[PDB]
Design the sequence.
């Protein structure tokens, strides 16, 4: 979704992580490989805000 | 192979191990035959005691 739409429909602007993996079933002794969709990681606008569930959010620094 | 060779640190050894575990037979594909015994070569530096 584009950023504007995310605010209009109360969504979260994010990105999808796909990584490759293989499982050798102990019984099988053979290899199957696919890229799994692990999840969604949020993206930032250049101004430094994140849109999460329709809300502009900002992370403060700590000392 | 050469008549004169000098002692060197590198230690080339070959390890041949059984493919499957003992007592458990895996399914054999009709197209490809199973490999009962296999062999491999490993390179390990000589190690001081």
Sequence:
């Amino acid at each position: 979704i584009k950023e504007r739409d995310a605010v209009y429909e109360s969504l979260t602007y994010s990105s999808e992580l796909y990584v490759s993996a293989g499982l050798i079933w102990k019984n099988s002794r053979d290899m199957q490989e696919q890229t799994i969709f692990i999840g969604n990681i949020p993206l930032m606008n250049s101004l430094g805000t994140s849109i999460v569930n329709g809300i502009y959010r900002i992370v403060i620094n700590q000392i | 192979p050469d008549p004169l060779q000098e002692r060197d640190n590198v230690q080339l050894r070959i390890v041949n191990y059984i493919l499957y575990g003992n007592g458990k037979p895996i399914r054999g594909i009709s197209d490809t035959s199973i490999q009962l015994v296999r062999t491999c070569l490993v390179l390990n530096w000589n190690q001081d005691k």
About this structure: The first helix of chain A runs from residue 3 to 8. The longest strand of chain A covers residues 32-42. Chain A touches chain B at residues 29 (CB under 8 Å). The two ends of chain A are 36 Å apart (CA to CA).
